[PDB]
């Protein structure tokens, strides 16, 4: 009882989850197949008992207003947790809005999301799990490289002599 988060019965439960996904950008490449992520995540969260709110094609101020709107929902009082799915282009410290460009930034910092949903600004979700899923790049560099392999064949993973 003390090691797990308490789960409310599915009776008078109003679990809410939020999906924010941007597909078309004025200066950034179109995120082809983003609808597959939206439909997949929304269906999974529905199977988990969450009523999914989906908002698409938003600016950084649009994302901020919708997140504050989502956090002020009275349904969280009769909920036990929430999910936050964010899918767009991304920078190192933030997620990109529709109008984002290197000259004209339109970025919502991930730190802003924690401020919106913490115990200070979101009373409905106090002591309740807040899960954030971020499908976005965090840079422009490749995440792989080539290195050496043990000269020894597959027979000897670990062997003495």
């Amino acid at each position: 009882t003390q090691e797990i988060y308490p789960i409310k019965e599915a009776n008078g439960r109003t679990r809410k989850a939020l999906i924010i996904c941007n597909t078309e950008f004025k200066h950034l490449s179109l995120r082809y197949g983003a609808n597959f992520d939206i439909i997949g995540m929304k269906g999974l969260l529905e199977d988990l008992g969450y009523d999914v709110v989906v908002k698409e094609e938003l600016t950084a101020e649009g994302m901020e207003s919708e997140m504050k709107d989502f956090a002020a929902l009275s349904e969280h009082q009769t909920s036990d947790s929430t999910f936050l799915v964010l899918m767009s282009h991304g920078t190192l410290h933030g997620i990109c809005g529709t109008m984002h460009s290197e000259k004209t930034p339109d970025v919502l910092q991930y730190d802003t999301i924690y401020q919106i949903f913490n115990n200070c600004h979101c009373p409905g979700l106090r002591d309740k799990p807040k899960v954030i899923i971020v499908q976005a790049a965090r840079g422009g560099n490749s995440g792989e490289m080539w290195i050496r392999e043990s000269s020894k064949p597959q027979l000897c993973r670990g062997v003495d002599l």
């Binding site: 490749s142 490289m145 050496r148």
Partner: protein
Amino acid sequence: ADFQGLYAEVKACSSELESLEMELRQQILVNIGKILQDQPSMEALEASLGQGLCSGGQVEPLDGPAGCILECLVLDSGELVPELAAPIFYLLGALAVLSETQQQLLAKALETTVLSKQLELVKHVLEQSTPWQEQSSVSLPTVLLGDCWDEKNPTWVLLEECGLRLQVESPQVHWEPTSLIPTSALYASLFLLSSLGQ
């Protein structure tokens, strides 16, 4: 074709090498300097890499420094890594265009950062002599000619052996269009060699 197509082609080949481990790029660079005094080893490595890139099958290992280079371009299962073998194959073809003296000089020159300075001189010669099809003269900045600029300077011999007429006084380089193919190869060579010591 122009110099811009040459740069993009060589830069793209050097781009895939940036993902190689630092020790492996140094092993390739040192062992290239070793086989640079051994033309049969360069010819054998070209054939092995060319056969492996075309067929996609196992590459028969080679001995000596040529094999040390091949270790850095193959998987455990024996196939070539196309992203890694192709730029090395491109470098070997450019070195094969060079003369034996130019190859021997490059073997001595990989050990330093003077290689970087030498690259931009050849680049400047190709840009300043454009249009390539006309004989022309090129003036060089004194900051690039080193402390002693004469026929005993190693950079002098590298450019002179490409078929360029050199002199001490400005203009120092006489561009002969018959030198285009070897000079370009030297540029491509100096580029890929410099990108490995980075």
